[PDB]
Amino acid sequence: GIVEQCCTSICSLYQLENYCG
Amino acid sequence: FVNQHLCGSHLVEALYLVCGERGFFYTPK
Prior knowledge:
The complex is a heterodimer of chains A (about 20) and B (about 30). Chain A is an all-alpha fold and about 20 residues long. Chain A has 2 helices and no strands. Chain A is flat and about 25 Å long. Chain B has one helix spanning about 10-20. The interface of A and B includes residues 2 and 11 of A.
């Protein structure tokens, strides 16, 4: 999930926006 | 500022900044 994608590995804007409303 | 390891409040802050009025869900699991 987001932690595995952005904390444990390097985040991206692409991935963050997956979590926007 | 998004292209790095972001944990905890730093991740939340990034979601905030990026999503703006759209809001966001944070589910650390």
